[PDB]
mmCIF file of the C-alpha atoms, coordinates in Angstrom:
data_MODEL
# 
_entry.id   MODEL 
# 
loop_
_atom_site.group_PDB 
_atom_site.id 
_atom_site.type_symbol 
_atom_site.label_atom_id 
_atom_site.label_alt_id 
_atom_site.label_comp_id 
_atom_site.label_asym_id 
_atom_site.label_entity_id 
_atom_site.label_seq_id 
_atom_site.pdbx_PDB_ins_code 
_atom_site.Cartn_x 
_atom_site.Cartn_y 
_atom_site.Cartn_z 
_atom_site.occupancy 
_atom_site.B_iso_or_equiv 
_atom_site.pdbx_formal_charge 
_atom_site.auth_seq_id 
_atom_site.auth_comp_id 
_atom_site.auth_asym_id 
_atom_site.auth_atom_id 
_atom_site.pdbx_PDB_model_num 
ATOM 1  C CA . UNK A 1 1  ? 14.394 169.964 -83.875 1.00 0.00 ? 1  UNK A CA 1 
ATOM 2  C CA . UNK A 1 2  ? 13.305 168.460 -87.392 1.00 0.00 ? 2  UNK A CA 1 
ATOM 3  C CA . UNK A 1 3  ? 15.254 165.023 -89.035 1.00 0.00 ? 3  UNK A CA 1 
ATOM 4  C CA . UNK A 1 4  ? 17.320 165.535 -86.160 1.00 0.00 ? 4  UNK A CA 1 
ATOM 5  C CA . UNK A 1 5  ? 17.384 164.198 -82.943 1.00 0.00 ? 5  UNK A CA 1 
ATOM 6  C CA . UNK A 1 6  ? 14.927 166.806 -80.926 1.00 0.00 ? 6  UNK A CA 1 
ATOM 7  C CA . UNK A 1 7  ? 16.721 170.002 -80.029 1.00 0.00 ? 7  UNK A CA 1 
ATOM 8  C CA . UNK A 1 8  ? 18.831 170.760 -83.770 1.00 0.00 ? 8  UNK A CA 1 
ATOM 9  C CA . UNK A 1 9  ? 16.379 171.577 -86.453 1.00 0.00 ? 9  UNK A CA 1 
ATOM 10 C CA . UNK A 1 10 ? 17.563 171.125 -89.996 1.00 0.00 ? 10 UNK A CA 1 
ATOM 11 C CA . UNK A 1 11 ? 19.049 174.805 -90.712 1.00 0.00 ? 11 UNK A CA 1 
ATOM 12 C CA . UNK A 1 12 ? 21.039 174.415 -86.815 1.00 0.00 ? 12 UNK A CA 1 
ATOM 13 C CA . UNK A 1 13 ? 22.607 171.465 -87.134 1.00 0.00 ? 13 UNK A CA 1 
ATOM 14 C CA . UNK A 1 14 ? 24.135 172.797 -90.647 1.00 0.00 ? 14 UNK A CA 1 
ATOM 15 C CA . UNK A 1 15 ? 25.112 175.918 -89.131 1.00 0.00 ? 15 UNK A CA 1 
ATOM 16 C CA . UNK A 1 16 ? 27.710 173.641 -87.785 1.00 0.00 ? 16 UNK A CA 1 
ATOM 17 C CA . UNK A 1 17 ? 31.243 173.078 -89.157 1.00 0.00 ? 17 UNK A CA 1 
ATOM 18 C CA . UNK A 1 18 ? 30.790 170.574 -92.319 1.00 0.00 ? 18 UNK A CA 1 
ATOM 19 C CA . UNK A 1 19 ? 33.651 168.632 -90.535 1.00 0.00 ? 19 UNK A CA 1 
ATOM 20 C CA . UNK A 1 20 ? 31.444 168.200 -86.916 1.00 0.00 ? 20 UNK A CA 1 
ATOM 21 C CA . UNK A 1 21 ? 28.303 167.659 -89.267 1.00 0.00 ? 21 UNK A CA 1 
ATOM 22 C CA . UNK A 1 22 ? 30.014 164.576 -90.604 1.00 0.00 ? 22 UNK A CA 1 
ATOM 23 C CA . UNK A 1 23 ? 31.737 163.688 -86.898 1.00 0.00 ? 23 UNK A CA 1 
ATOM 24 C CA . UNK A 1 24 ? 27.649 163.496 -85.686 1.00 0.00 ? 24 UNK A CA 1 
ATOM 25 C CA . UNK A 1 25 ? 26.617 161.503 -88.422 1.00 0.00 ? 25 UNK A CA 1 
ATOM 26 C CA . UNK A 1 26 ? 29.432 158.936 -87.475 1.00 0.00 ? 26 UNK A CA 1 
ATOM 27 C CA . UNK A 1 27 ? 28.146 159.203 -83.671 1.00 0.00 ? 27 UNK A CA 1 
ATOM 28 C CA . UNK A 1 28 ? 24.925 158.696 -85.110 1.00 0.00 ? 28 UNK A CA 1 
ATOM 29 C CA . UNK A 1 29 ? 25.696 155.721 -86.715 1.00 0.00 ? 29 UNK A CA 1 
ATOM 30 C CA . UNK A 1 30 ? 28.009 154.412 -83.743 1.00 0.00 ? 30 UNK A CA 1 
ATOM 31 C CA . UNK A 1 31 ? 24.646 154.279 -81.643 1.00 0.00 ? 31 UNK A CA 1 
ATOM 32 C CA . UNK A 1 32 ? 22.092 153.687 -84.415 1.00 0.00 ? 32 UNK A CA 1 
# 
């Protein structure tokens, strides 16, 4: 992982679904 947490690097995490891409960057900042 890369500007991401440690395990997603860039190109996984937007291999995900725009909508869960935007769900994480809520969770992201709910604990940041």
């Amino acid at each position: 992982g890369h500007m991401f947490p440690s395990d997603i690097d860039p190109q996984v995490f937007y291999e995900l679904p725009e909508a869960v891409q935007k769900e994480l960057l809520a969770e992201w900042k709910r604990t940041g």
